[PDB]
Amino acid sequence: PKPYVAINMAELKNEPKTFEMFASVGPKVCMVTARHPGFVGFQNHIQIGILPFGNRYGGAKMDMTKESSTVRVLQYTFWKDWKDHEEMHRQNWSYLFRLCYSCASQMIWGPWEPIYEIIYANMPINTEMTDFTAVVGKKFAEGKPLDIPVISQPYGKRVVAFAEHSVIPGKEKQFEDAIVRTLEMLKKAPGFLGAMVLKEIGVSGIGSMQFGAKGFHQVLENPGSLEPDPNNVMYSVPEAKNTPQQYIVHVEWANTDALMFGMGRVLLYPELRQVHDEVLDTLVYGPYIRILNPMMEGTFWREYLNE
Amino acid sequence: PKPYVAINMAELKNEPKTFEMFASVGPKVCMVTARHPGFVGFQNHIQIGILPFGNRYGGAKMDMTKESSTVRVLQYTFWKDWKDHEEMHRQNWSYLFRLCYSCASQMIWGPWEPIYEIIYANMPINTEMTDFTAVVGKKFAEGKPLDIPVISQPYGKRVVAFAEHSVIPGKEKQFEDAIVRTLEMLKKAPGFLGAMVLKEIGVSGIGSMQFGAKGFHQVLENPGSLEPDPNNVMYSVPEAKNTPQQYIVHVEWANTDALMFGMGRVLLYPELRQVHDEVLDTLVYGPYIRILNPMMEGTFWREYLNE
Amino acid sequence: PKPYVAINMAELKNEPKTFEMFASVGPKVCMVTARHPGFVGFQNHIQIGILPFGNRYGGAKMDMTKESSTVRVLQYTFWKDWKDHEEMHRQNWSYLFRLCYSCASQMIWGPWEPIYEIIYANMPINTEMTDFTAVVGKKFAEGKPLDIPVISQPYGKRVVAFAEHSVIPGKEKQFEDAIVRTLEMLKKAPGFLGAMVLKEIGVSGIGSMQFGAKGFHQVLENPGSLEPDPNNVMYSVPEAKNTPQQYIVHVEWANTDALMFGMGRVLLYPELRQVHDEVLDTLVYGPYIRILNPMMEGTFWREYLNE
Amino acid sequence: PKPYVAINMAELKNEPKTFEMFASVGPKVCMVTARHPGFVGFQNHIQIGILPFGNRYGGAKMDMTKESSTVRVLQYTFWKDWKDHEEMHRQNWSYLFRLCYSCASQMIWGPWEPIYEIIYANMPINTEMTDFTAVVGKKFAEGKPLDIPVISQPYGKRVVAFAEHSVIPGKEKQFEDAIVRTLEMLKKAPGFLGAMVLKEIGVSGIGSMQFGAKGFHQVLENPGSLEPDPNNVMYSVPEAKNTPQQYIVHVEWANTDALMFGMGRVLLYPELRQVHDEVLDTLVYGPYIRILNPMMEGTFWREYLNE
Ligand SMILES: [Fe+3]
Numbered sequence A, B, C, D: 001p002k003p004y005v006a007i008n009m010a011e012l013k014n015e016p017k018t019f020e021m022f023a024s025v026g027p028k029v030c031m032v033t034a035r036h037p038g039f040v041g042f043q044n045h046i047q048i049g050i051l052p053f054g055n056r057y058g059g060a061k062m063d064m065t066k067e068s069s070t071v072r073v074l075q076y077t078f079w080k081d082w083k084d085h086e087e088m089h090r091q092n093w094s095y096l097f098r099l100c101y102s103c104a105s106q107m108i109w110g111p112w113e114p115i116y117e118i119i120y121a122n123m124p125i126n127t128e129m130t131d132f133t134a135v136v137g138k139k140f141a142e143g144k145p146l147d148i149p150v151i152s153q154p155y156g157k158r159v160v161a162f163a164e165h166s167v168i169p170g171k172e173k174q175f176e177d178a179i180v181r182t183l184e185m186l187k188k189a190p191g192f193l194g195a196m197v198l199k200e201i202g203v204s205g206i207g208s209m210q211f212g213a214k215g216f217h218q219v220l221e222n223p224g225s226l227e228p229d230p231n232n233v234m235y236s237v238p239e240a241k242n243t244p245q246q247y248i249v250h251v252e253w254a255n256t257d258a259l260m261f262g263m264g265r266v267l268l269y270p271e272l273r274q275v276h277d278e279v280l281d282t283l284v285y286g287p288y289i290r291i292l293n294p295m296m297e298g299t300f301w302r303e304y305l306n307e
């Protein structure tokens, strides 16, 4: 079935100590998160650049890692029910807060953790280049050759286009129909590895470290080993859902060239351009497309998605 | 059928002369071993690093080769009957001892050669990336698409997770049942190339150069061309079997990322985490996971394994 | 009386940060350990090298500190009753785990903490070179000139031969008789500062951080300020006792030359070589001799030993 | 059908001007050779090293290109009838000699051109990694999945074991039967890309520039634009056939590791070792194994071979 998605967002100094902490602390957080039986996996990204749209963002390029002074992370966790995410944070707060807080010494902005429902998904299981013979053999033995996926390699060996959109109030249906039609045609592009449309349902205050006054002071005053009061979050997840409605269009690609010209198909192929034009007519904001590297992941979330 | 496994272990100076001796003497030892008709192949590893488990072993990483002052080798030889290994050593002692002993000038610890029975094996034949077309064609021609293996490349082009365990006396059955269930679920991870469970049955005194006093003095006094008395081994293989019972869980992976997150699946996927928890409850020691590179191998041992 | 000995073993990166933690955190652990009235002292070693036995370990030397990428520590604590050690760890777990775990960032292997009984001891009190005048005067005043010891200088000013052995099941009596006879003759060697034989009685799971599944997850997930459940250790000390029986022959020496040729007396002096040959006839493993520097110690453990 | 093989052999200075001539003049020679309708293709090799067989040739390694002062070339041309090769040289002598002679300025030894019959061939068509999808589709559409070959990549993207043998007179039948059995078993090794056995039938005097006195003087005196009398060859091809009988065992491999351990299978796999031992019992000379890079080729000779 379709899981819910929490995306933890933050911006940190681009220096070796940040990446040392990714490698040491990241796994620990993921292991804590996996204590909850509603957890079905994760996909953790670093932003490597921005789609420039020609020279619309002429100061950007798809790989800015050599020049950038900061690194932005977008850590997807997948949940049978979004309330499992909230319950996991509270049941494991002593570990989670202390682990997460240890990153603050590198942080510039964040954490900020919106929650999403998936309204469209065309996402295969991941496979390494070593696996495809066995996959092909198993599918033919089962009489299901149409269920053979593209080879979507895990752990930093593909790229993600992360396209931010917000929609004019009253135009959500037009957006949702037109984007699905767009993505159904987009899948013809070479190197297309999957797409999904994420629709924001709210924001996790506890995952965003957004407390009332008491918890705010405890965060700011914290030596690192005392948790803020997790009951001092003053709003529930749906109370923070944004209007204009926000969407992420998440499309995965074999490489950044396939991404650039593949996403460009909605501009370069006249039949698809007419369909995608109905998306553009609905927007308050966007599309703004971040280029992501999915470095650390628990790929079994796609097994839950695809049953 | 399942062979028995002798694993010769040693630690040597990490320097070019050590690796030159691997290239010159290694093939010779292997050629001598192949004089015995019970020999069914070999798989020789160098340890390249240690799985850090986040920062549990924070001084380790999966590739420590650029920094490490020593190199550990783990030379698997496979035998129709474990007595064939002992018989091979005695029949070829003059060649074998003189070859092995020529390594002493680089040695820091070893050799130490425990013997194992395989209690579980899911290990395919190796193939190069050039072979898979013919393999697929042959398997479809035979009506056996399910026998198409993953592509497990030989000669240093994959990595091994070598997981050391010792088990509380009386918990061997729980360990063995739970670890087999764990590995049957683990094979879903991307880049999984096979796994087997090795259970120690004893130690080869002759292969460990562990003699009585007479042989001990001959070893210490040796100019390099005179063998110790091979009948001066004071214990049979089963007499040295350890209690607590020792096991090796040997899992092969496409690359070190697939290994890290693939082995991490027993911690990150809740359903598999509950099963693997039954393994952890049985342990005196471990799991301690060495990262191995299978550089030199006689891949036909897997042809014997899978018939 | 003879105390019991716990030996905490670990391997860490050989870099200045490691040694700063030894000087900063080491004293704290010892101060916590001294909270228990059964604690009678400690002797903490770093391994400086390996006895090469001619060129049997030709890649090793007695002092490898300038070239080694790792450092091995062997921390002896002395206990009136071995159960005091287990009780001490549990009563003070909050301090001890958080202190010990702070080392993990430098750790490559460990900790591993077997427990031993002393079956033989000829070990003097330590004295500095300034003390011997008063010692001599006091002993002669008491009419006991035979109780005047060698000058065994504390705090890194002598060396230890740490000789590992494991014994064929059924040969423990022959081993113990022969090694005591050997050590009684060995004390004639110049620069001999004492010897003792340690016989393993088990392994401390809590001191080895070997828990069941629950504690394992608490260790891997730990931010550093949360203890694992110390009651989640699944085995008592004797349940982990190894067969083949393991022994340490611990011999102290004025310097590494005295060590090399002194231990060599069991090979070079015919009368002693014949006695020591009876030890060698019993061995599954060894002798393997590590060279240790006893840097940090509570010398009063020898006062308890010698009453 | 099986073509005949001429192998033009030479040794040249290992310097850039030599390789510039290979790229500029080599194609011209091949285009001239292709004037004759009996020409069915070519496979031109440079030797990159020698198989050391452990340390039997301890001064050799598989890739000696960085240190070697010379480069050996082995140019195979394939012919419907070996007499076509002789006819082509004479009909095109003015072009061929002038082209070939232009290389003399780099030459140290050669040219020498023995002629061979193929007594065994298991050689697939070459394919690039881009082709295998269409090949698989075509073979399944034809109902012949067993005819799907391994991927044998052309133009320098595989390696060749060139194994020289000469055989005791009277033992040719034993050699030919045993080597065919050997190669039929060898094809199980990973990365095996094909094998054929070449049996010398003679030497082309004209291709070796071996004339009588008149032609010899014309070669030595040549300004580069005057042909020696091509009728001054004093011996036919069969008159120069060597006794002891000479064979080449030509085995192709995915890479030099697959070659080293793949060819090693005749030494490391007991069942194959017993068979290949019948080969070794017949030898006057060899096996001596050169490592070749098939750089420039007309791959259609395998199409003629396999019909
Ligand atoms: Fe969260």
Ligand SMILES: [Fe+3]
Residues within 6 Å of the ligand: B006, B008, B085, B089, B113, B204, B207
């Ligand atoms: Fe062996």
Ligand SMILES: [Fe+3]
Residues within 6 Å of the ligand: C006, C008, C077, C085, C089, C113, C204, C207
């Ligand atoms: Fe302890």
Ligand SMILES: [Fe+3]
Residues within 6 Å of the ligand: D006, D008, D077, D085, D089, D113, D204, D207
């Ligand atoms: Fe020719």
